[PDB]
Symmetry: C4
Subunit: 332 residues, 4 copies
């Protein structure tokens, strides 16, 4: 083996990230303004805009979830607060019209009760929110939830980074599979644990397991530009979950911060020291203030529509069949 040892499977793959690829233009009859951006969040739920906001306490509380749903996407409420408070945020969203909402639960002691309270509150999507869903504890939770409330509530499981892990969630009964181990902007899983999978390759691998079972893949983490959304969907994801890109918006939690004459908002990992208040796997930082969510979403969707125009994709389903070119370091 050219890279060492005698085992060709030791280094199993070459992992590509968003900056490693570009979408190739293709024959097109599609104007960007006329493209159809709708896509499956889960087997049953279709969104007008294939974007969901991260279950983080500096991204999504009731305000964000309401704005996201009104923009045609959805918010996933974070779970870093008492169960009664999360359920109360679910209610607040549902009382603002017939708006879709999801909410994160863990696999811990009180996870099952949290889930039951959220259902009672009228939640549409339950997200089993973990760093590593390839764990019998996570797969059991996913299964237990689907068998209990599956008729009324869609159950998302995550996160995974390999084909085998996505396959296990599919078998456990997941209505969607969330992909991303290591790629988050505030993530230090890669440096702390040495663990991860570049996101384009992880999406391609997860989609190979999920698509044949009609299970949508949510691409979660590592998205920096609107063009990365197009790339994630062309790799086969059906939606993208955004943290950093939305953390600087008016609707996110947290106050405005002024440093050196410029405006910021705090953005922090759920595995950072201050969020857990131990070995942190996230940092605390700031992102530029971006103004209203509606503006940000408009530019993101605008970029998506441009990609759909370039690739001749009339629908997201068509975009998922687009081709890439791999680029070198010099490209960029």
């Amino acid at each position: 083996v050219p890279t060492g040892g005698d085992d060709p499977t030791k280094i199993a793959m070459l992992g590509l990230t968003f900056d490693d690829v570009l979408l190739l233009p293709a024959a097109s009859d599609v104007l960007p303004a006329n493209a159809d951006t709708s896509s499956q969040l889960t087997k049953k739920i279709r969104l007008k805009v294939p974007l969901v906001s991260s279950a983080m306490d500096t991204v999504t509380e009731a305000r964000m979830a309401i704005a996201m749903a009104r923009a045609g996407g959805m918010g996933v409420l974070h779970r870093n607060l008492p169960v009664a408070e999360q359920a109360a945020q679910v209610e607040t969203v549902k009382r603002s019209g017939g708006l879709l909402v999801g909410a994160a639960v863990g696999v811990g002691d009180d996870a099952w009760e949290r889930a039951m309270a959220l259902r009672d509150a009228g939640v549409d999507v339950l997200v089993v929110d973990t760093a590593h869903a390839h764990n019998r504890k996570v797969l059991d939770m996913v299964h237990r939830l689907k068998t209990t409330v599956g008729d009324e509530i869609e159950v998302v499981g995550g996160n995974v980074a390999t084909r085998a892990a996505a396959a296990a969630l599919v078998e456990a009964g997941a209505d969607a599979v969330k992909v991303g181990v290591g790629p988050g902007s505030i993530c230090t899983t890669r440096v702390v644990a040495g663990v991860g999978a570049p996101q384009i390759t992880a999406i391609l691998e997860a989609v190979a397991a999920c698509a044949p079972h009609g299970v949508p893949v949510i691409a979660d983490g590592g998205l920096q530009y609107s063009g990365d959304i197009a790339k994630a969907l062309a790799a086969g994801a059906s939606t993208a979950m955004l943290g950093s890109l939305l953390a600087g918006t008016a609707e996110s939690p947290g106050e405005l911060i002024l440093v050196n004459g410029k405006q910021f908002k705090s953005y922090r990992g759920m595995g950072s020291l201050g969020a857990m208040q131990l070995v942190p796997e996230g940092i605390e930082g700031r992102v530029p203030f971006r103004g209203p969510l509606s503006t940000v979403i408009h530019q993101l969707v605008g970029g998506l529509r441009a990609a759909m125009g370039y690739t001749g994709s009339a629908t997201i389903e068509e975009l998922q069949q687009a081709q890439f070119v791999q680029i070198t370091a010099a490209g960029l």
Copy 2:
């Protein structure tokens, strides 16, 4: 597939850009001063110098087009102004002697009338100027133009980045094919839409479709150094179109700008916010002031001549048969 999924065509190619390759020296009897730099702009039109200026409102108006033609190249007049004004710039050039001139048209409402006015004004080359020529609307325009004024006017179509798109323009009747989706210095197509193709690979692919039909390829965008011109032509292009490299010249539109004791001129994408005055696919910036066009062209052609000396190329046609070595990140 080592990079993910089971489809080997999903990532179709490894795209190389100018910084990824060097020209290999070869046996030579050619002195740089004696090389023949002439080359086909289109099937019918040969230039003394294989360089054309970009159809941008910070690069080419009448003054640039006159200087470019006198230097042995050609200018393509931008179309960001009323039809009567563009036609008046065409006249202004033709009244400055028997100088070649081209002019951009789009595919929009008034594109056909613009084209007719330009012809009446005496234009030599019509450039169907789009970000994505692989669109039936663009191919139709190219065809409609060639069938109407083809005897008197050469019709360029662009831009493309793939072999199939170049082939479609050839069949539509293009007299030259312009290559470049994503590589412009002021371009944000890559980050906004996630779409593009590294320019050496795009030229190689387009030339594979065009050369067998005797259709010249214009390499458009991404050229930073005189050595990049040599590389573009050795990849098989017949001419290079330059924006950034000429935007800092006395003959370009726009005034001199002083910042921190240094001289600049504004240079902006035609898809930037201020040029369109929406989801911009270009930025606005500045380039260093370079002095007279004649000086810049002299150094560019000087570099080209040096490359022709190193590669034993007596003509541009010979240079198109030169070989590359691929380099690594460390090289550079």
Copy 3:
């Protein structure tokens, strides 16, 4: 041969370093808190924590060796001082309870007497400490030591970077093989001599020679983050030796340094000008002050435990069978 010449063996391999790979998550029933971090330092000696401190005069004297052993690892005492002083540091450690300790010897004039004095002082591990163990002088020393004190003292040999060199040390009778030629943070072997081997590939190659003989590999040098420890062990090493990561600790030798309002400690190669007081193969620098060793070790082991959780590794032996994904420049 695509890279030049006609000999495919001239460039024998593509060497990967820690930043070139990530650990892939795998099916897991392992909680980080419950993972077993114990591992073989040598054939006979198992540590509770697979970490040893570098035999450097800015890393390990008696204080460090005591702290390291109490934390479940071990220190290797540096040999840059009189033999009687090194032996006195060995005694000092052994008088602080039943704590494991090792000590470096060279291959020079007084190396054999140093070794004998260390044994008399009660040392547990002798480390034949060289930059290049593939030297008959080093192999002879290793052999001579093992045949003389082998029943009572474990003999480590190093350093190596190739499979053949590790194999030679195994045959010489080494109880562990230390891997790393070129990767140290303060190392200039690579720039001064042009010699080295990227550490993941060197570990994989050394383990291919050592593992079939039940000889543990110590990964020495180049480790920057806790995640690198996980990667080194997954490549097949049984322990990691740390210099830079521990040089900033309270227990390391040297005083606190204040520069620009921040706290540092000096950290220098044993082959630097000031350590040898000639052609230096190390530099002198500073690392940030890190506080007590116990804190640093806790975070390092925490990262290791996280990796074991992600990879489903209940033991270090299991972690050694984990898989990597190779990443590109863009990843990082």
Copy 4:
């Protein structure tokens, strides 16, 4: 072809430079102090130290040539001055004992007379000094010189970057072949002409043509560290020619320069604007002042000796058979 077009020979090779490779350690009985550093400069001339100074007017005049010869290497006198002055510098060196000296000539009008005057002055080596020796004008000069003064004077030809060019010089009768098109520190051939060849691959290719005919290769340009000398010789070169590494020495021409409290000397390409006093293919810069040549050479040779120790090379001939590992961007 994965990188574009249908011609696999269009991109002929992947070119590696010094930073792309490391020397692999090997079994060794060689102490650095005992290695034999002597090597062939030409078929007939062996140097004690395999280093020659560049024929540049900021590197080698009489003073440098004398110091270089006394250190066991040789200087090549630059040709940027009247013929009588160059010949007078040759005399000055020969009058300082039985010291070897070489001198550059071109292929121009007065090149032949320059060569004759140098011979009369007692020169030992004539270097036909060009940027591209694969030119019948250069090959003719090499041949004409060898057939005229070949019994008394060794004739070097250069520069080349390909196997075929080296082969042509061998057939022309060169006593040594100098390799390097594009790699010089002050070189802009790569950016101006887009032409070049990464130096490790160029050396490997040139040696494939020269070694079977017993013709030594001089590696010229791109050497930044003493470790690069070892790498150049292990690729198969017999000597290295140094510009930047020696330009900062007391013995080089030019005065001391003080900027921001630090000491420098000017270092400039022979193809820079100021050296030619047009399309320059070199820049003018400064390098740090390094003190006496003897110190610099000592450290360079020290690094070489270290490499010989690591690779088990008792002679330069043995070092030429050493193996490399290719490294990634992350390595470094």
